[PDB]
């Protein structure tokens, strides 16, 4: 429940690549849009942003549309190698294809939403996704925000931790997604590795990380709050590497009282609104 009178819609958008309809929550308001990507435990009824935050209310009459894709638990909003090998998934996740081709084509044709000049905003699994979308689709996403994202997924223990978190969230298999940790797909989808693309594209990036407890990150099966701490440290390394590589269009927010939780992710979504407005609409 939120503010009465919001013109929020839900849509059924066919995905040819996944052979099914993808539900999408939507609020109009302008030709450019904020894509609000969900976390590891994404449900099939509503996007976590609508469940847990007043995102639609906060961006109402902002001059921006809001797009909340629904579904894709543990998908990393990526195109997988194969159907998840364990939990009986009967198709291959193709969420990069959906977000960069199928969905923007549908929204353009039916509503006049621009496929270019948008923002991607993600958290947990989709924080990295948002930066990867900006790295490889800069005309679509000149703005990307990562809130408690896993920003060096190919490094050290990260492939192991991501595998653990995915198995704990619906029994999904990281091997089916990007292959063994040595597979090129891990580095392809590693924001840290792709920093020079973000720099050369002049992507406007907004990067947040909390720390500690409680956590909505997922990966609760990982012991000793290790994921919560490693997430922060890798985000801090990302800030430093971005600067060292010539990056000059980023904001890095690591407040010591911040948590990896919907209340802080919403606080950041509100805080970045003026930032997004100035970048996408002038």
In order, the DSSP letters of 40-106 are TT--SSS-HHHHH--HHHHHTTSS-EEEEE---TT-TTSB-SSS-TTTT--S--BHHHIIIIIHHHH
The CA–CA distances, whole Å, from 256 to 84, 103, 180, 219, 265 equal 37, 37, 35, 21, 14
Q: Which helix (H) or strand (E) holds 251?
A: strand 250-253
> Which residue has 């920003």 as its token pair?
151
- So what's the architecture of 1-282 in CATH? 3-Layer(aba) Sandwich (3.40)
Instruction: Return all residues near 75 (Cβ < 8 A) that are at least 6 apart.
Output: 42, 93, 95, 125, 172, 177
Is-catalytic flag, 124? yes
Is-catalytic flag, 260? yes
Q: Is 101 annotated as a binding residue?
A: no
For residue 141, give both structure tokens: 């996403």
For residue 78, give both structure tokens: 């990526």
- Length of the chain as a residue count: 282
- Give the Cα separation of 17 and 130 in Å (integer): 20
Q: Is 230 annotated as a binding residue?
A: yes
- Domain boundaries along the sequence of the chain: 1-282
Q: Is 215 annotated as a binding residue?
A: no
Q: Would you call 14 helix, strand, or coil by DSSP?
A: strand
- Give the Cα separation of 82 and 217 in Å (integer): 25
Could you tell me the resolution of this structure in angstroms? 1.3
- Give the Cα separation of 104 and 108 in Å (integer): 6
Cα 278 off chain centre by: 21
Is the distance from CB of 168 to CB of 231 less than 8 angstroms? no
Q: Which of 40, 47, 37 is nearest to 9 (CA)?
A: 47
**Catalytic residue of the set 32, 74, 260, 267:** 260
**Catalytic residue of the set 62, 146, 148, 228:** 228
- Give the Cα separation of 174 and 250 in Å (integer): 30
Task: Beginning with the edge strand found earlier in the chain, give each strand of the sheet holding 250-253 in spatial order.
Answer: 9-15, 20-27, 65-69, 33-36, 119-123, 143-147, 204-208, 250-253
CA 164, 165, 167, 173 dihedral sign is: negative
Instruction: Return all residues near 162 (Cβ < 8 A) that are at least 6 apart.
Output: 150, 153, 174
Q: Which of 133, 128, 157 is nearest to 217 (CA)?
A: 128
Q: Is 188 annotated as a binding residue?
A: no
- Give the Cα separation of 242 and 254 in Å (integer): 15
**Catalytic residue of the set 65, 124, 148, 169:** 124
Q: Is 233 annotated as a binding residue?
A: yes
Is-catalytic flag, 215? no
- Give the Cα separation of 51 and 216 in Å (integer): 13
């Amino acid at each position: 429940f939120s503010r009465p009178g919001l013109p929020v819609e839900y849509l059924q958008v066919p995905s040819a690549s996944m052979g099914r309809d993808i539900k999408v929550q939507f609020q109009g308001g302008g030709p450019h849009a904020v894509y609000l990507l969900d976390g590891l435990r994404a449900q099939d009824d509503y996007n976590g942003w609508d469940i847990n935050t007043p995102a639609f209310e906060e961006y109402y009459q902002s001059g921006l549309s809001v797009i909340m894709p629904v579904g894709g638990q543990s998908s990393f909003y990526t195109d997988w190698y194969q159907p998840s090998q364990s939990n009986g998934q009967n198709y291959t996740y193709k969420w990069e294809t959906f977000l960069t081709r199928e969905m923007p084509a549908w929204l353009q044709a039916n509503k006049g939403v621009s496929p270019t000049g948008n923002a991607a905003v993600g958290l947990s699994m989709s924080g990295g996704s948002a930066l990867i979308l900006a790295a490889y689709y800069p005309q679509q996403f000149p703005y990307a925000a990562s809130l408690s994202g896993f920003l060096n997924p190919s490094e050290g223990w990260w492939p192991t931790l991501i595998g653990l978190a995915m198995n704990d969230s619906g029994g999904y298999n990281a091997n089916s997604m990007w292959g063994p940790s040595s597979d090129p797909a891990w580095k392809r989808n590693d924001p840290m590795v792709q920093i020079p693309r973000l720099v050369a594209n002049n992507t406007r990036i907004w990067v947040y990380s909390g720390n500690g407890t409680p956590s909505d990150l997922g990966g609760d099966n990982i012991p000793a709050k290790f994921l919560e701490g490693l997430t922060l440290r890798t985000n801090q390394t990302f800030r430093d590497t971005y600067a060292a590589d010539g990056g000059r269009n980023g904001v890095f927010n690591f407040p010591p009282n911040g948590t990896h939780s919907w209340p802080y992710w919403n606080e950041q979504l509100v805080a970045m609104k003026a930032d997004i407005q100035h970048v996408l609409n002038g």
